[PDB]
Amino acid sequence: SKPMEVYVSAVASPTKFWVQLIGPQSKKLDSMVQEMTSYYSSAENRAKHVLTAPYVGQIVAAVFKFDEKWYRAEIVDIMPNQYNPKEQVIDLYFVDYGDSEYISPADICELRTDFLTLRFQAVECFLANVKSTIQTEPITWPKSSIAKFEELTEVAHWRKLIARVVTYKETPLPGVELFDPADNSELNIADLMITQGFALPL
């Protein structure tokens, strides 16, 4: 299996997380985020792309106020605002990173068409050859297993990892093996989790 340099950009669980491919793609992403952030920081530019008639599935531009950057995002739900009956709350999937956020429609614009050019950068994966420690079910990962995995991947802190795709599950979802080339271990991330009791094999 060919080693692939990736970042883990977002995590739900060891069996649901997102990677970005390192290379020409990651540099293009960085450039797009800057251009979209410059462009939509202008009230006059936003005025050209007023969000009207939003629908589930629409690809939009949205600012994440806490980092003040503008992102490509997919509307996955349109929900009531419990405090404010004037606005909805929009559930947005951030297509280049993999996190989802609840976002006010005030922070959303229609996406300028040319910003659609770049392939959506976040690739959803599961960690191959592991399962939850908890065998009573419906089961999910213990929060401590999720935190271990976030720590091992150093999610969203630009830690390069070496990925190999080794299986698939129901297009197919890729199951990957992850290795940290900067740690001092020959074990991959699945093995570290199993040997330390945060996951079980099979």
d(CA 188, CA 112): 41
d(CA 115, CA 119): 10
Structure-determination technique: X-ray
* Token pair of 192 as six digits: 């570290």
This structure's resolution (angstroms)?
2.0
d(CA 20, CA 124): 9
Share of the chain residues as helix, strand and coil, in percent rounded to the nearest 5: 25, 35, 40
Backbone φ, ψ for residue 116 (5° rounding):
-80, -10
d(CA 194, CA 62): 39
Q: How far is CA 70 from CA 61, 117, 129, 159, 189, in A?
A: 6, 16, 36, 22, 32
Indicate the CATH number of 1-34+115-202 among 2.40.50.90, 2.30.130.60, 1.10.3720.10, 3.10.450.50: 2.40.50.90
* CATH number, domain 35-114: 2.30.30.140
Backbone φ, ψ for residue 39 (5° rounding):
-65, -45
Q: How far is CA 29 from CA 66, 110, 123, 177, in A?
A: 19, 19, 14, 24
Q: Please, are residues 180 and 186 in contact by the beta-carbon 8 Å criterion?
A: no
Q: What is the three-class DSSP state of 53?
A: coil
CA 72 to chain centre: 12
Q: Which own/partner pairs from 155-160 qualify as long-range (CB within 8 Å, at least 24 positions apart)?
A: 155/8, 155/9, 155/10, 155/11, 155/17, 156/8, 156/9, 156/10, 156/97, 158/7, 159/7, 159/8, 160/5, 160/6, 160/7, 160/22
Q: Where in the chain is CATH 2.30.30.140?
A: 35-114
**Alpha helix ranges (H) inside the chain:** 24-40, 43-47, 143-153, 189-195
Q: Where in the chain is CATH 2.40.50.90?
A: 1-34+115-202
Closest C-alpha to 149, from 91, 194, 110: 194
Amino acid letter for position 195: T
Closest C-alpha to 11, from 201, 189, 197, 186: 189
What's the farthest any 2 CA atoms get from each other in the chain? Answer: 56
Beta pairing class for 123-127 and 173-179 = parallel
d(CA 150, CA 144): 10
**DSSP conformational letter for 106:** G
